[PDB]
Amino acid sequence: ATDLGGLQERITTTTKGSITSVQAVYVPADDLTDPAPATTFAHLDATTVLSR
Amino acid sequence: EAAAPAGPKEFTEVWNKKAPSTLIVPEFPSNYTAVKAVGEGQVHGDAFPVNFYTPHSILSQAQKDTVVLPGVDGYFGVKASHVPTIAQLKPGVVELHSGAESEKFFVSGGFAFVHPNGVTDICVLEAATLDQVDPAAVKSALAAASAAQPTDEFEQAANRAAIELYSALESAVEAKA
Amino acid sequence: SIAELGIYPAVDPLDSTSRMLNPNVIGAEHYNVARGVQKVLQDYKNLQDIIAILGMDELSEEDKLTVARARKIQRFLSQPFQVAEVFTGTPGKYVDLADTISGFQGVLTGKYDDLPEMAFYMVGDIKEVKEKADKMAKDIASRKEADNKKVSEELK
Amino acid sequence: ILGMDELSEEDKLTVARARKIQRFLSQPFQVAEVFTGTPGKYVDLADTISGF
Amino acid sequence: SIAELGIYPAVDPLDSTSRMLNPNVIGAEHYNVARGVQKVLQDYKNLQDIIA
Amino acid sequence: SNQAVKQRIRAIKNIGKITKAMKMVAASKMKNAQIAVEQSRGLVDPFVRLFGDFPAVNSNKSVVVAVTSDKGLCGGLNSNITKYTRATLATTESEGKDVVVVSIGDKGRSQLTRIESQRYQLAIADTYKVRVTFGQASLIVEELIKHNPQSYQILFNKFRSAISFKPTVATILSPDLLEKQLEDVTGNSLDAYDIEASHERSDVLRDLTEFHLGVTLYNAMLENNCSEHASRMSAMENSTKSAGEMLGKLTLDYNRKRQATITTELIEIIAGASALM
Amino acid sequence: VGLSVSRVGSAAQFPGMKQVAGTLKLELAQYREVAAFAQFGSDLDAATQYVLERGARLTEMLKQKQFAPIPIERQTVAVYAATKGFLDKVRVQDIVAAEEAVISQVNPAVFKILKANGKITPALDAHLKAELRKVKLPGA
Amino acid sequence: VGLSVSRVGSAAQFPGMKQVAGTLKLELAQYREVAAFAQFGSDLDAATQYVLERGARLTEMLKQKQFAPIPIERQTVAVYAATKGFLDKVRVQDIVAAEEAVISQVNPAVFKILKANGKITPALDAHLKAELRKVKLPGA
Amino acid sequence: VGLSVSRVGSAAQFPGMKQVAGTLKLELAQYREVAAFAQFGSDLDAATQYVLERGARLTEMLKQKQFAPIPIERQTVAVYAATKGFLDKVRVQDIVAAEEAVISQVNPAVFKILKANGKITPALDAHLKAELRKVKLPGA
């Protein structure tokens, strides 16, 4: 949570400008409760699902 | 003579004496018909309601001013304010006329009811329309029927029923325009 | 899972054991009522999956007799506690041992098939399930016309 | 399971409105105009609120 | 599973494999009654979803 | 254990696929059986305006008929009229009458000997296998005329819509035994009709009651056949739903046991490496 | 509501709300009980369909917007307005607007008497039922 | 019974018990597969229903109260009384009392010569055939 | 087919196979939903049964024996013989033989100009329909 939090907290809006991040999210074993997506989902402000 | 007035609403109260109340009172086939027989009206001059019915299909619910039905005494004709008539029909042709145009079904045999409110109720089993009958098997079927003279009463009732349906079908397939 | 059903105390009856549940210790009819209750609850436990997907209307009549009997003894094992009346309001019930053997002997034989299920819920013994059903029946028959206001224009 | 002609007269309008929503969410992209010929269009936020 | 039916030897027919089941080795007349038995037993396994 | 839920998942995943196929099967049967119910509903009407509808008559012998289904995945249909046929057979007999109980469908005999064991005499089944015809309903009618009652009671579910199936009591009186007697209201109600039969009125009423019995029974097992397909379409939209919520709770619990198995295997490998290193 | 609990809880609540929300958590219990078994749309008792329409009104009564907390006196009047039948026949898409009308159209003195007494006195529920009769509910 | 194995097997079984256990091991094998179809007592078949009750006579035959072991000769007579169909008349719920009726009402010399001969001899399986007919079984 | 992916294969194959593998990728995909649906073949719609008859025709065509790889111009015409008509009359049990019928009976100079051009040209398309009609399929 602090490796992701070390990366994702540099992506923000400051008084000079902003970095807006579009991150492709892989979900391991189709489990949204897995710690890699569930820690990533704490930082996400939007999701854009592209479906077949 | 009328010592037990039964009915659909009278089945409501007695069943509300002896059944559990968590079942509502069941419905009846009286509740699903909007046209009765004794009540005055529904002839309005020329055209009465006819209802030609088979078990498998409904063939007319329209209004005609005249119906020709093949009774067991012979082909009668129902006009508008006809007498009430429960008429058995032999194998013959039902002619429903509303004017110059004519729809003529050859029926297998089954009753026709003219009611005290002018409504006619034809009730047959099989209705062969006259343009779809086989004219090549009307004569081949009566030939084995006229020669099968068996010893049992059941087929003698069945053979007498056999030729009389075929013989009225020869006379219903020849002189059609 | 039993506590989320509202059954309190949330004792799993098919998982709670004692060395006193022995017919040479507690008696013969206490032991048979207890083993008879656990057989109805185990048979209902075996039916939970097919009731979940197929529904109530597909079991046998022999099955849906025990489904109704085990749904009756599931609620009847619950009880208001005297220490829980501070936050539930319902007063507690010290049920005697003879009151719960003969209370649970009646449900297994079929003496109370006609009572509703919720009459068994949060009562002391087999008398209070008969009084709760009368109260339940009275509540759905209780109706007043114009509900006796006498509140407007109260004199001084 | 039943058919297009099955459901209600008001719910033909729901199939009418949603199907023209589903095409109106589509958009040609300016980056794809080289290999699909048709140009791409930037929709402003004030247009897509009022247009929808 | 085969032994709970009482069938002995409890050889699973759709899990036992041999390198000898090439039709180049045991011939095609043995090969087709072996592949046909595995076909009809896999079909019955596919039908026990309904007929059980 | 962790495979016991993995095998339980594929079981419920196919039940929700099987009962989704049975629902679309029963919705395709319900749409083409419905085109035959309205065509059979017409011929019922001229008999109930010629003979009325008298469900509570003083019969001394009766034949009740409960029209149920053959297959039993219907969901509250074949026992619903069993609740009604026990409510009718507690309504008619308060005077010591005879009653013969007949059920159509395999789910009728299997729930009428539960309640009525002595008056059950005949079981018709495998009616709805190919299709229901009028000639088939006629032979079922004829065996109700082997017994010679004063009345008949037919219990069936009428297909009002795909939701409501109101159970109907349809009744047929025997001609010169009891049908003529209920019509004697200040004279008779049947004398307005001029009988155009070959024989007299008691023989045309015998042919007319049997024709009334054959169409009321043919309509009964057509109304009940698509009230069964619509109940099977609704019993398998509740089952595919319930086996999708059960599968939803099984994949969440498997994914907890999947994650707990990797943490357990890992902790045992770290505890064994730290014991040596 | 079925799982959320407060151990200490009822020993430390508003005595106005303690005598109003007792029949709120009881009627919401049946609405949870009915709509756990009436999911299928099987049949209706017209008393179970009554508590289905009553429990749907209490649920909208407990909806709340964000960053707008309500004082406890304007809360217990709004639960008094919905459990004592004054919000009957108001449609369930209107109760957000309807108890915005209840709190705004009732005299402010009722909220002040209830805040200071801490309890719905017999002189107050006589007067508060009067002031809820005189409320322009939407749709009527 | 499905998961229980003994790999010595019937090589070290009491003979006589071994004669009746084959009828007991086979019928309980069919009684287990007929189960998961037994929830439909409306669905009678009378061939599965034959073994759905016959195995259930055997299942409640094998029940036993604790701290009371039975001699082996009294057991193989009680399995003989249910594999040959003597207890087919009694209901399923009263076989544990019927096994007492089999034991307490036969001649107790049938057990004395079964223990000594070690197997149900041809001069015994017609003796104890009629001996289980002069007992009264709690089912009628 | 439901789980095996080739994420380069969107236009990275034989253009003649890409004519017909796109329809095979859809007509097998519709079959996979309704395969485990209608395991029975009793009571079937006139639309879903055609997917179950075509999808079972497409499955049997794709299987092949070990150590016999086929040239790409010869598996193109066997998918073209199944994507199009020409095989909607062999049952399921003959499409293994009906495909090698098509490989044997069709004039093998269409293979020389399918492989050299790389796609199904419309002149070759018309001869492909004509050559796939004079074949003797073993459905008999």
GROMACS .gro file of C-alpha atoms in nm, chain H residues 45-92:
model
   48
  951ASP     CA    1  -4.179  -4.593  -0.863
  952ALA     CA    2  -4.226  -4.915  -0.655
  953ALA     CA    3  -3.886  -5.049  -0.770
  954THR     CA    4  -3.678  -4.768  -0.625
  955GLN     CA    5  -3.947  -4.737  -0.357
  956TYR     CA    6  -3.892  -5.107  -0.289
  957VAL     CA    7  -3.527  -5.047  -0.203
  958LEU     CA    8  -3.584  -4.699  -0.058
  959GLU     CA    9  -3.767  -4.872   0.226
  960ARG     CA   10  -3.561  -5.195   0.231
  961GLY     CA   11  -3.234  -5.010   0.282
  962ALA     CA   12  -3.409  -4.795   0.540
  963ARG     CA   13  -3.496  -5.112   0.732
  964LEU     CA   14  -3.125  -5.189   0.719
  965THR     CA   15  -3.016  -4.838   0.816
  966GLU     CA   16  -3.226  -4.837   1.132
  967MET     CA   17  -3.119  -5.196   1.189
  968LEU     CA   18  -2.758  -5.081   1.227
  969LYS     CA   19  -2.841  -4.820   1.492
  970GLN     CA   20  -2.722  -4.911   1.840
  971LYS     CA   21  -2.721  -4.758   2.187
  972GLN     CA   22  -2.382  -4.700   2.339
  973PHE     CA   23  -2.205  -4.885   2.625
  974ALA     CA   24  -2.404  -5.195   2.531
  975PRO     CA   25  -2.213  -5.410   2.284
  976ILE     CA   26  -2.407  -5.696   2.133
  977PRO     CA   27  -2.277  -6.053   2.099
  978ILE     CA   28  -2.195  -6.135   1.738
  979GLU     CA   29  -2.453  -6.415   1.715
  980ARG     CA   30  -2.735  -6.182   1.821
  981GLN     CA   31  -2.623  -5.937   1.554
  982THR     CA   32  -2.618  -6.178   1.259
  983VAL     CA   33  -2.967  -6.297   1.351
  984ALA     CA   34  -3.086  -5.936   1.349
  985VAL     CA   35  -2.928  -5.879   1.009
  986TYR     CA   36  -3.085  -6.208   0.895
  987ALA     CA   37  -3.421  -6.076   1.012
  988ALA     CA   38  -3.392  -5.774   0.780
  989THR     CA   39  -3.210  -5.913   0.477
  990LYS     CA   40  -3.456  -6.201   0.432
  991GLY     CA   41  -3.748  -5.962   0.471
  992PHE     CA   42  -3.898  -6.068   0.804
  993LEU     CA   43  -3.909  -5.703   0.914
  994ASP     CA   44  -4.064  -5.576   0.592
  995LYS     CA   45  -4.405  -5.544   0.758
  996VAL     CA   46  -4.290  -5.303   1.031
  997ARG     CA   47  -4.265  -4.931   0.968
  998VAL     CA   48  -3.931  -4.757   0.940
   0.00000   0.00000   0.00000
